[PDB]
Design a protein around this nucleic acid. Structure first.
Ligand code: SF4
Ligand SMILES: [Mg+2]
Ligand SMILES: [Mg+2]
Ligand SMILES: [Mg+2]
Ligand SMILES: [Mg+2]
Ligand SMILES: [Mg+2]
Ligand SMILES: [Mg+2]
Ligand SMILES: [Mg+2]
Ligand SMILES: [Mg+2]
Ligand SMILES: [Mg+2]
Ligand SMILES: [Mg+2]
Ligand SMILES: [Mg+2]
Ligand SMILES: [Mg+2]
Ligand SMILES: [Mg+2]
Ligand SMILES: [Mg+2]
Ligand SMILES: [Mg+2]
Ligand SMILES: [Mg+2]
Ligand SMILES: [Mg+2]
Ligand SMILES: [Mg+2]
Ligand SMILES: [Mg+2]
Ligand SMILES: [Mg+2]
Ligand SMILES: [Mg+2]
Ligand SMILES: [Mg+2]
Ligand SMILES: [Mg+2]
Ligand SMILES: [Mg+2]
Ligand SMILES: [Mg+2]
Ligand SMILES: [Mg+2]
Ligand SMILES: [Mg+2]
Ligand SMILES: [Mg+2]
Ligand SMILES: [Mg+2]
Ligand SMILES: [Mg+2]
Ligand SMILES: [Mg+2]
Ligand SMILES: [Mg+2]
Ligand SMILES: [Mg+2]
Ligand SMILES: [Mg+2]
Ligand SMILES: [Mg+2]
Ligand SMILES: [Mg+2]
Ligand SMILES: [Mg+2]
Ligand SMILES: [Mg+2]
Ligand SMILES: [Mg+2]
Ligand SMILES: [Mg+2]
Ligand SMILES: [Mg+2]
Ligand SMILES: [Mg+2]
Ligand SMILES: [Mg+2]
Ligand SMILES: [Mg+2]
Ligand SMILES: [Mg+2]
Ligand SMILES: [Mg+2]
Ligand SMILES: [Mg+2]
Ligand SMILES: [Mg+2]
Ligand SMILES: [Mg+2]
Ligand SMILES: [Mg+2]
Ligand SMILES: [Mg+2]
Ligand SMILES: [Mg+2]
Ligand SMILES: [Mg+2]
Ligand SMILES: [Mg+2]
Ligand SMILES: [Mg+2]
Ligand SMILES: [Mg+2]
Ligand SMILES: [Mg+2]
Ligand SMILES: [Mg+2]
Ligand SMILES: [Mg+2]
Ligand SMILES: [Mg+2]
Ligand SMILES: [Mg+2]
Ligand SMILES: [Mg+2]
Ligand SMILES: [Mg+2]
Ligand SMILES: [Mg+2]
Ligand SMILES: [Mg+2]
Ligand SMILES: [Mg+2]
Ligand SMILES: [Mg+2]
Ligand SMILES: [Mg+2]
Ligand SMILES: [Mg+2]
Ligand SMILES: [Mg+2]
Ligand SMILES: [Mg+2]
Ligand SMILES: [Mg+2]
Ligand SMILES: [Mg+2]
Ligand SMILES: [Mg+2]
Ligand SMILES: [Mg+2]
Ligand SMILES: [Mg+2]
Ligand SMILES: [Mg+2]
Ligand SMILES: [Mg+2]
Ligand SMILES: [Mg+2]
Ligand SMILES: [Mg+2]
Ligand SMILES: [Mg+2]
Ligand SMILES: [Mg+2]
Ligand SMILES: [Mg+2]
Ligand SMILES: [Mg+2]
Ligand SMILES: [Mg+2]
Ligand SMILES: [Mg+2]
Ligand SMILES: [Mg+2]
Ligand SMILES: [Mg+2]
Ligand SMILES: [Mg+2]
Ligand SMILES: [Mg+2]
Ligand SMILES: [Mg+2]
Ligand SMILES: [Mg+2]
Ligand SMILES: [Mg+2]
Ligand SMILES: [Mg+2]
Ligand SMILES: [Mg+2]
Ligand SMILES: [Mg+2]
Ligand SMILES: [Mg+2]
Ligand SMILES: [Mg+2]
Ligand SMILES: [Mg+2]
Ligand SMILES: [Mg+2]
Ligand SMILES: [Mg+2]
Ligand SMILES: [Mg+2]
Ligand SMILES: [Mg+2]
Ligand SMILES: [Mg+2]
Lengths: 208, 96, 99, 69, 82
RNA sequence: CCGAGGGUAGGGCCCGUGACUGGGGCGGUCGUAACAAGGUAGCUGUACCGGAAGGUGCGGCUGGA
RNA sequence: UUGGAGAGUUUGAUCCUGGCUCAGGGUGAACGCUGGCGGCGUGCCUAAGACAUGCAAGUCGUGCGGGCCGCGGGUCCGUGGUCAGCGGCGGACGGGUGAGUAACGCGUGGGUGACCUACCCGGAAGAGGGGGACAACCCGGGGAAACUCGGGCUAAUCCCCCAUGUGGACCCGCCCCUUGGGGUGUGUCCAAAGGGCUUUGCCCGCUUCCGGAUGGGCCCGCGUCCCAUCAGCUAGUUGGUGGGGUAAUGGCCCACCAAGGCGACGACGGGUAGCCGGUCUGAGAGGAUGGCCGGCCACAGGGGCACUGAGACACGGGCCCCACUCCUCGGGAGGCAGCAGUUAGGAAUCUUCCGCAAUGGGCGCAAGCCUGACGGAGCGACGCCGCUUGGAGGAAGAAGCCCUUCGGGGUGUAAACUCCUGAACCCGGGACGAAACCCCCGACGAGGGGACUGACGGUACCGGGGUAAUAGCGCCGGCCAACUCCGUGCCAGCAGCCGCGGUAAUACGGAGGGCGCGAGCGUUACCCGGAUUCACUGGGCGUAAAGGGCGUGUAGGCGGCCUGGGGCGUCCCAUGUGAAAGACCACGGCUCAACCGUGGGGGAGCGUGGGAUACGCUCAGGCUAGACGG
């Protein structure tokens, strides 16, 4: 299954705060603040000039590690993209983002995708009032991303729902708070989202 | 160590005997009838030819001769009997 | 339809049968270029009327013998002994492709 | 190594009797096995993978050389 | 004789027939003469039967006989109504 | 009559194997043919000779002077 | 216009040529180390070696007669079990395998005026009379078995004759039509079988003939591997006349006449191979492949053969030869390339399972019986797909370990620790797959209504409760993402190519660290790719590999300017074919996906008809710039 190990190190290698830890990421106690060099015995060693493969390799793990996902599943999504109409990179982020477990995080139901994935695998979420635990459920335009209403009386949805009364879910989402629901209205535009990811470097990688 | 297969085999032998039996007589008769046409013996030919003719179609009734078979047999018995008699005619009685 | 084909009589030295050589053309499936190829058909002449030179049409017909499966349809042209040489001079040439 | 135990036989004076089980403290012959050799412990699949006490004793006493002509 | 019967497709525990016309002595799921409409015995979607009743008549006329449960879904959508 | 095949006899192709022998490849002994005009320009087809490289005759080539 | 990346290694250095090598995708895989759950798939590639044992094809008492067991009562009749037997239909389907086959076997498009098709469905006619055989059972030999023999009685939808002739068949003739297609006239020739119930009629049956349907057989064009260090082949050979054979054309077979037939466009011969839909790879063109599934073929230990039949030269039918094996003196027995299983070979390949509940096949009127087809279950990371080993907080940062200029650095928010969730498990409920066949009203029809039936399965899923709960493998000189310390000292070893190891090795071994993948990671084998390195797309030959020593000429390929006819190539439109699964786009079912369902879009390619005429082709006239001549 998923990456599961020490997760700061991901960010320290990648030279970019990926906001994996969620609640802690903004603290001065994150690792990227105190030491933003790569993990392990050799980070404070004056880094060396990176090859093109490297550059696209690092760029790729970057995108991948963000959504916290198996290189298997990642590549297969990606393949779906190329064959699908029009702009590959965009449709990639699209399908990357049209996946459930990450939705739940976009809608702040949970702190991080990790925490989100748990929530989703646990039956604590439902699309359309049908209970759905598979973190790879590609959500399609029109879906009602409920919280399980028998999961409602639960300290942690509350806490996170509570810090979500009037922040802004991106242009494609619609958190009716209080009632625990929300909605998937639009597959993202490229501009719709900024991640520290050159959408193109990744296409150039899988071209080798 | 089983069957009604052997029952089938059992039967076929009984059947075989009969197909073979009728089949013989046809040839025997056709040949005989034909024979007479080479000497003719106009009357006697046809008489046998008749009997040949008949024993033919009769056998086509069952699994012995296909219709198209009996059809061929007569078709050739006939041509042969008429043509021989063409050498010294006198066709009487009837079968042509 | 009964395939009709057109060709020259190259052998009539048979008895109620004539050999009809048939060219066809088509493009090479890999190299585009048009190429000729050919085939000798044993052809039924029940009234022996066809002879050397006689470019004719023959038609797909029911079997008459082993390897006769066409009968001549209609005399189309006459005396093309240039084509007849064009085929003897090739045949003949064979006597020096041996060892 | 895993191994299928097809049939179980008791050997009598005159005939071979098939039997559907063989309890503890008893002897019989199992048909089906493929890799098992003598002095090899055998356990049901979902059980402690214990190895029975082996056996062990005498070293060979006489030695003879063989020449592959 | 020529027949109308259910030619299974789909997958394991997902029956998905395809009531069909084919020579009696084919494999169940082998080369058929004509497809005259499906059938989903599990009832998983609004269309768990659509006999081409235009076609399904033509056959019955010229010979074709049918399963004691071919006709079941042939009657069910009435190829028999007077 | 034909006929599985059996048998007699003589052939063709293939494969394996064989005392011994021929060179070929891979990992000390003799000389110094080639690379500098390489110490006789080199190479060449052929031919005869020579432990060996090679030498020599005749002709050719320059990719030599 | 949804499609195309390159690197390393020849020198002191360079450019070019050129080979080698690597990254990628794929698999019926196998091997190592490791391994938790589940879904769909999938699983003897080898010895088409040999097989123990069970099972895999039967059904009908509504075709007929019988031997035994009964049950209401007067050795009787009745009826239903029951074992055969005669008799029907099936057993030619379905299931297995790829040996043989380089072939009309297959693919694709056609031909049959050269043909067949049980059951099924339409339509027309008929079902009169008389006769007769064999099993069963009774009698009696032989055998230790297989099991057989001879004599004697017996039924029928079994067997034959006569009549009926709607009609069919054949000879001759004639009308049409053109290969044997349809009509007609005379002669001749041919049909049948009964059972059933509620009995002045319905139900299943049988006969001849016509048409349909589906299934076939045979024939033809075109496509289908390697060697020319295989170059010539051929006597049933090629053609003919007559005849046999068949459902039917044919040298299919036979007798005779003729002297032919085939071959560098590759005959003959040798090798290898079942083909296709498809699959994999590829930018494409192309290369490679044909296991699972669907279509055709071929085979049933090795051969040959025919019988019965609508259909077979018949996988679990028959005969005969051969090899092998088993049984206990005349002989008998066997054929898992059906399902499981065994044995052997092998790197390697599963349960002697469950059920006929579903779908489909056989038989019967029906109830029903039979089905190792099939529906499911088990085993296997073999493949793909989903899922878990947790989530939030948690130090200027514990211990141990690695490094160090000795100050510090790293593993590392990682751990401990707080808390939130709650895989497994525990209880409770619990399926869809199954509505027909049949019974009832109607009319045994249309419509209506009622009943029985679930292997998987107490499984999926639902509902309640509910424990922090497996991680491993490859790499870290360059290609190529990832670096230090010790050990070692051309040793031990690494290695795909360069090359690394001779005391300070980022290249061996261990450690800490790191990179990549993660129930997997690697390795070997092989296919396509990079290989534009067989070059059609898309290469080359002065010196790199590569111009024939030079002519003359055969076939072949190619071919100037003008006008015209044809329209073969070529272009265009129509139409048929191009099965299903697949692939592609859309939607939809399983919570998702894999898997799967429904619809859409079709193309090459070939048939058929119409059209165009520039280029090429052919034919017909003219030219003189090429060429030859004076
Ligand atoms: S906390 Fe800082 S270090 Fe840890 S993940 Fe969030 S961003 Fe990276
Ligand atoms: Mg709860
Ligand atoms: Mg790629
Ligand atoms: Mg006699
Ligand atoms: Mg017969
Ligand atoms: Mg008949
Ligand atoms: Mg002839
Ligand atoms: Mg002989
Ligand atoms: Mg012989
Ligand atoms: Mg013999
Ligand atoms: Mg030899
Ligand atoms: Mg020297
Ligand atoms: Mg010199
Ligand atoms: Mg010299
Ligand atoms: Mg020199
Ligand atoms: Mg010399
Ligand atoms: Mg000497
Ligand atoms: Mg000398
Ligand atoms: Mg000289
Ligand atoms: Mg020089
Ligand atoms: Mg590349
Ligand atoms: Mg080198
Ligand atoms: Mg050099
Ligand atoms: Mg060097
Ligand atoms: Mg190179
Ligand atoms: Mg590529
Ligand atoms: Mg393994
Ligand atoms: Mg299951
Ligand atoms: Mg399975
Ligand atoms: Mg096999
Ligand atoms: Mg294979
Ligand atoms: Mg046995
Ligand atoms: Mg009986
Ligand atoms: Mg039969
Ligand atoms: Mg084969
Ligand atoms: Mg051959
Ligand atoms: Mg062919
Ligand atoms: Mg063909
Ligand atoms: Mg029959
Ligand atoms: Mg009687
Ligand atoms: Mg009569
Ligand atoms: Mg002859
Ligand atoms: Mg003839
Ligand atoms: Mg004939
Ligand atoms: Mg012949
Ligand atoms: Mg003939
Ligand atoms: Mg002669
Ligand atoms: Mg040719
Ligand atoms: Mg061979
Ligand atoms: Mg083969
Ligand atoms: Mg290419
Ligand atoms: Mg197949
Ligand atoms: Mg055979
Ligand atoms: Mg055989
Ligand atoms: Mg065998
Ligand atoms: Mg045999
Ligand atoms: Mg059989
Ligand atoms: Mg047989
Ligand atoms: Mg056969
Ligand atoms: Mg068998
Ligand atoms: Mg088996
Ligand atoms: Mg072994
Ligand atoms: Mg096995
Ligand atoms: Mg299996
Ligand atoms: Mg059943
Ligand atoms: Mg049934
Ligand atoms: Mg069974
Ligand atoms: Mg699994
Ligand atoms: Mg997986
Ligand atoms: Mg400090
Ligand atoms: Mg520490
Ligand atoms: Mg410290
Ligand atoms: Mg943590
Ligand atoms: Mg709790
Ligand atoms: Mg049910
Ligand atoms: Mg009634
Ligand atoms: Mg329960
Ligand atoms: Mg629950
Ligand atoms: Mg823990
Ligand atoms: Mg690796
Ligand atoms: Mg790599
Ligand atoms: Mg590097
Ligand atoms: Mg030191
Ligand atoms: Mg040492
Ligand atoms: Mg190593
Ligand atoms: Mg060192
Ligand atoms: Mg050194
Ligand atoms: Mg090292
Ligand atoms: Mg290395
Ligand atoms: Mg290659
Ligand atoms: Mg290529
Ligand atoms: Mg090459
Ligand atoms: Mg080229
Ligand atoms: Mg080149
Ligand atoms: Mg040179
Ligand atoms: Mg020259
Ligand atoms: Mg020469
Ligand atoms: Mg010329
Ligand atoms: Mg011209
Ligand atoms: Mg020309
Ligand atoms: Mg045209
Ligand atoms: Mg298709
Ligand atoms: Mg869906
Ligand atoms: Mg479709
Ligand atoms: Mg002219």
């Amino acid at each position: 299954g998923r990456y599961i190990g020490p997760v700061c190190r991901l960010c320290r290698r990648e030279g970019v705060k990926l906001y994996l830890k969620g609640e802690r990421c903004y603290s001065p106690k994150c690792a990227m603040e105190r030491r933003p060099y790569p993990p392990g015995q050799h980070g404070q060693k004056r880094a060396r000039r990176p090859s093109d493969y490297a550059v696209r390799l690092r760029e790729k793990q970057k995108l991948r590690r963000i959504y916290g996902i198996s290189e298997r599943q990642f590549r297969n999504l990606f393949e779906e993209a190329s064959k699908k109409k029009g702009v590959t990179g965009s449709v990639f982020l699209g399908l990357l983002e049209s996946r459930l477990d990450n939705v739940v995080y976009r809608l702040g139901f949970a702190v991080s995708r990790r925490q989100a994935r748990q929530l989703v695998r646990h039956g604590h979420i439902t699309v359309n009032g049908r209970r759905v635990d598979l973190p790879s459920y590609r959500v399609r335009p029109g879906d009602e991303i409920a919280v399980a209403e028998k999961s409602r009386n639960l300290e942690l949805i509350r806490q996170n729902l509570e810090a979500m009364k009037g922040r802004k879910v991106g242009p494609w989402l619609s958190l009716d708070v209080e009632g625990m629901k929300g909605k998937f209205l639009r597959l993202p535009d490229r501009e719709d989202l900024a991640l520290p990811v050159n959408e193109q470097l990744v296409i150039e990688f899988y071209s080798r | 160590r089983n069957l009604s297969a052997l029952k089938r085999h059992r039967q076929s032998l009984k059947r075989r005997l009969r197909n073979k039996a009728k089949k013989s007589a046809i040839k025997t008769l056709s040949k005989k009838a034909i024979q007479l046409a080479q000497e003719g013996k106009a009357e006697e030919a046809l008489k046998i030819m008749r009997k040949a003719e008949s024993l033919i179609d009769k056998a086509a009734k069952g699994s012995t001769l296909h219709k198209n078979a009996a059809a061929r047999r007569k078709s050739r018995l006939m041509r042969k009997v008429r043509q021989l008699l063409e050498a010294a005619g006198a066709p009487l009685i009837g079968g042509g | 339809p009964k395939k009709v084909l057109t060709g020259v009589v190259v052998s009539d030295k048979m008895q109620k049968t004539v050999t009809v050589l048939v060219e066809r053309q088509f493009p090479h499936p890999l190299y585009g270029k048009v190429i000729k190829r050919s085939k000798k058909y044993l052809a039924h002449d029940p009234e022996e009327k066809y002879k050397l030179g006689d470019v004719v049409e023959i038609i797909e017909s029911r079997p008459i013998s082993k390897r006769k499966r066409f009968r001549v349809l209609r005399l189309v042209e006459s005396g093309r002994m240039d084509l007849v040489e064009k085929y003897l001079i090739r045949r003949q040439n064979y006597e020096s492709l041996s060892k | 190594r895993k191994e299928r135990v097809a049939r179980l036989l008791r050997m009598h004076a005159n005939h071979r009797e098939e039997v559907e089980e063989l309890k503890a403290g008893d002897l019989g012959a199992v048909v089906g096995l493929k890799e098992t050799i003598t002095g090899d412990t055998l356990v049901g699949e979902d059980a402690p993978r214990v190895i029975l006490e082996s056996i062990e004793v005498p070293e060979p006493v006489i030695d003879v050389a063989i020449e592959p002509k | 004789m020529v027949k109308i019967r259910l030619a299974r497709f789909g997958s394991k525990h997902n029956p998905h027939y395809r009531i069909v016309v084919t020579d009696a002595r084919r494999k169940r799921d082998g080369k058929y003469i004509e497809k005259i409409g499906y059938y989903d015995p599990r009832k998983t979607t609004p269309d768990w039967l659509k006999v081409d009743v235009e076609r399904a008549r033509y056959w019955l006329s010229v010979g074709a006989q049918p399963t004691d449960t071919a006709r079941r879904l042939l009657r069910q959508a009435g190829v028999f109504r007077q």
